[PDB]
UniProtKB/Swiss-Prot annotation, chain A:
It is found in: Plastid, Chloroplast thylakoid membrane. In the N-terminal section; belongs to the AAA ATPase family. In the C-terminal section; belongs to the peptidase M41 family. Induction: By high light. Coiled coil: none annotated. This is ATP-dependent zinc metalloprotease FTSH 12, chloroplastic. The chain holds residues 673 to 768 of 1008 of the full protein. Probable ATP-dependent zinc metallopeptidase.
Swiss-Prot record, chain B:
It is found in: Plastid, Chloroplast thylakoid membrane. It comes from Arabidopsis thaliana (Mouse-ear cress). This is Probable inactive ATP-dependent zinc metalloprotease FTSHI 4, chloroplastic. Functions in chloroplast biogenesis and chloroplast division. Required for plastid development during embryogenesis. Might be involved in chaperone functions or play a structural role in the thylakoid FtsH complex. Homooligomer. Interacts with FtsHi2. Belongs to the AAA ATPase family. Ubiquitous but preferentially expressed in young leaves. Disruption phenotype: Embryo defective. Impaired plastid biogenesis and thylakoid differentiation in embryo. Defects in the photosystem II protein complex formation.
Amino acid sequence: VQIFGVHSAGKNLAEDIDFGKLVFRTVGFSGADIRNLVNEAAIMSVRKGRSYIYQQDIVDVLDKQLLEGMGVLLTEEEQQKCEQSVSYEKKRLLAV
Amino acid sequence: KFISAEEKTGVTFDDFAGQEYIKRELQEIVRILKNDEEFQNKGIYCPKGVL
């Protein structure tokens, strides 16, 4: 938390920013990892045109970093079309 | 005296397709490098090496 505060001082964090609720997502991180997380949060906040960094910005940055791990690099349209490709009977089994 | 300091190759982004996520991610880095002042105002720094 202190490293995140040090490396995210000179950026316009919004009122919903709190790193105390995202500590468990950064277990094993070093200072460079948290700095890269802050930088990617700034990039993604710029990406949607958002002026500040939201908590959803950091959440989506961590989620993108996690989804990139297993070899899934898909945009929103491809993901939605692929979700619509499967049927409904074989989706309720996964849901259950 | 062999390295080509080529300014134009004739191959654009429209020629390479199918990996639009990687294309957009490289577009972000290229735009950051070209527009370093505007994005550096908010503290964004580009990576030195992309592999």
